[model samples]
Target chain A: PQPVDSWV
Target chain B: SPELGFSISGGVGGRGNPFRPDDDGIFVTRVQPEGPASKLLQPGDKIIQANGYSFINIEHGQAVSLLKTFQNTVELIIVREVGNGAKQEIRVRVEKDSSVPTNLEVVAATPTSLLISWDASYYGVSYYRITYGETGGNSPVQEFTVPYSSSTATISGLKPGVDYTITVYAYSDYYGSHHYSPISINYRT
Candidate 1:
């Protein structure tokens, strides 16, 4: 799985 | 020696309520005392990502298993704070190298001549280990075994059959020359 885009 | 760093990995088992399948994120029930997340997360925190992976969409057991497989010097987590109706907050949490000693150590498997030892996986990321053992009393020469970080269990051989031995495991970190030892010695025959 790929890392989620940072929402911070 | 001196306080250096700490990380949040896995220990004890799942936190309070762990995971809810229908939910996207793993709910935080309760973080253990002095645990990596003790200060970082709260009972209402919901973990959405681990090391940047979208952790929320995964299966319950898969999420727990994923964290169990993670062993790093630093762990980055993205959590959503569930409070304030219609308003939510997301923030980044970083877990450093923990300085506490490993816990729940046990001799899981044993034979007359060999012993298989295991313990809670360190969140601090262990660099190596020091295994020391001798006769039940301290009269015999102490045997030492140094193992790498990838190993959690040591298969000790060359021991006298049916003989009682006292063993202790020491977790070491080169970051600050930190050494944390198990409190009680495991006495096994």
Candidate 2:
């Protein structure tokens, strides 16, 4: 969940 | 706590909203514009109560989970931007990708570009209007002008050999869990 979901 | 999965390397959920999730997560909920779930929050953000912020992001993303479980990954690499029409939200891509379009690139490119890519963002924009459909299925193309992007670019130039059922939205607008229009066939090679 640190990937920031690729900044959505 | 079988709900045990949180050293950041964890999983399990049924609630989240102090902001974002605890984990059972991955990807932009993949093509997030999802095609269903207009539950629009009534059981309350669960804790979020429609205070909304699903950039699909709102702090390590800890939203009241459900909506077919957000952050459900499946595919990746899609980016496109066209600007105009009041610059289509995100304060005009943060004033034009700010100091160099830093924050702007989401489930865009006419709804997920097969060409968008698994990389960085640039001077892009969208909320397109339309383009040649049914001889002009009407037109609404927006801040267009591409280099190598797809997902029905502004409106067809040929990239559909198959896999085309897209939907996404997260560069900040309605926030998270929407990617239900999935199919992305790419080209038949």
Candidate 3:
């Protein structure tokens, strides 16, 4: 479920 | 382009931004923790919720992105602050099947004193690998044939603040190995 981003 | 799971994000996700989920590991929903763990873990939100976000949130949330490390394991490198970068997937590949299971349980445990029993799944593959570096260094140190198992392995004797993750994989060729990364943090007293 990870594989996240910085939401920039 | 890859953070790019650029080892590399061979697929098209690398073309722009967002390398997508590629490598699957050998463990749980890729699971989380409580506080003291929460404070040291940083962020007002339950740090364990962070764990639950990935490790436990999969089916319920189904947001497979990319990660710098394997989803099932914890980062060997600890962060002084809330290091979100650690969660970035480094590459992007075509995930056919996440063959990330060893041969244990859908859910496993970390030993308090060391003595395991049978329940849930059939057998258990206890993995206790360690830090500073490449992946968990493992403790189920020895391999066994029981439906239940555990390793006596330890990492950097500094047990207290050291980060650790454990999960059980089941051993049946016909059945898929169930993984349960103890995605929570607790005191090893």
Each candidate's DockQ = 0.04, 0.14, 0.07
Cα lDDT tens digits for candidate 3, B105-141: 2233333222222233212222222212212555543
Per-residue accuracy of model 1 over A1-8 as CA lDDT, tens digit each: 11111101
lDDT of 2 by residue, B31-55 (tens): 2121221111111111111223332
In order of appearance, the predictions have TM-scores of 0.36, 0.16, 0.19
Q: How well is each residue in B1-189 modelled by candidate 1, as lDDT tens digits?
A: 211133222122322233333344555543445755666665545666776566645654455445545554324454553534443555645453332333435446465444444454433433444444554555654444443233344545634444444444444332223345543344454
Superposed Cα deviation of residue B65, candidate 2 (Å): 24
Off by over 4 Å in 1: A1-8, B1-24, B73-82, B96-189
Interface RMSD of each: 13.2, 14.2, 14.6
lDDT of 3 at B35: 12
Candidate 3 residues lying further than 4 Å off, grouped into runs, are: A1-8, B1-118, B122-145, B148-158, B174-189
Best-fitting candidate, scored by lDDT: 1
**How big is the positional error of residue B155 in model 3, measured in Å on the Cα after superposition?**
11
DockQ pick, better of 1 and 2: 2
Global lDDT for candidate 1? 0.42
